[PDB]
Homo-oligomer: A and B are copies of this chain.
Amino acid sequence: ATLKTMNLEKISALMDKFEHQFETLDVQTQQMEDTVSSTTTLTTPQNQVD
């Protein structure tokens, strides 16, 4: 029953989708992390960290 309602083609699809959506949620966190980095740019000057 289970191998009918979740066949290997349907699993292949699900897995590809899973991966593609986590690629998206990585693009998203990147641009949140760059928004915070530029918003707080005066609190951490580069030369003081170096």
Q: Which residues of A (1-33) have their CB < 8 Å from a CB of B?
A: 3, 8, 11-12, 15-16, 18-19, 21-22, 24-25, 27-28, 31-32
Chain A contact residues, majority secondary structure = helix
User: Which residue on chain B has the smallest CB distance to residue A41?
Assistant: B19
Stoichiometry (number of copies): 3
Interface status of A39 (Cβ within 8 A of chain B): yes
Interface status of A38 (Cβ within 8 A of chain B): yes
Q: Which of B8, B15, B35 contacts A35 (CB 8 A)?
A: B15
Known: A8-B24, A39-B22. Contact between A15 and B32, CB under 8 A? yes
A20 to chain B, nearest CB (A): 9
**CB distance A27 to B39 under 8 Å?**
no
